[PDB]
Amino acid sequence: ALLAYITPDYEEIARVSVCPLNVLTGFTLFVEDEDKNVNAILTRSELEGRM
């Protein structure tokens, strides 16, 4: 969550949950901007930020 917050032009955080459904991992709900890069566009900045 912290490194998704401090990365510019990233998908923004809606929620962050620790062990949802008693599942031994967390879950961050990321919301995309469909009007920004439709369903077809990926840039190197977005890919490296995702990495």
Binding site: A14, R15, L29, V31, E32, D33, E34, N39
Partner: protein, 51 residues
């Protein structure tokens, strides 16, 4: 029609639901009522929808 909390920003929630059809929305509100029951409420909140 059903019972939901009135202080819900349905736009922000619909922004989080990027890429959905309408029956998907319907079923998501149904399971949001299920999460409201899990948390112990009769009304649906945006927290319940995100859950």
């Amino acid at each position: 029609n059903k019972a939901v909390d009135p202080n819900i920003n349905w736009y922000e929630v619909a922004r989080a639901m990027a890429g959905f059809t309408g029956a998907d929305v319907m079923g998501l509100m149904a399971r949001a009522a299920r999460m409201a029951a899990r948390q112990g409420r009769h009304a649906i909140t945006e927290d319940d929808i995100y859950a």
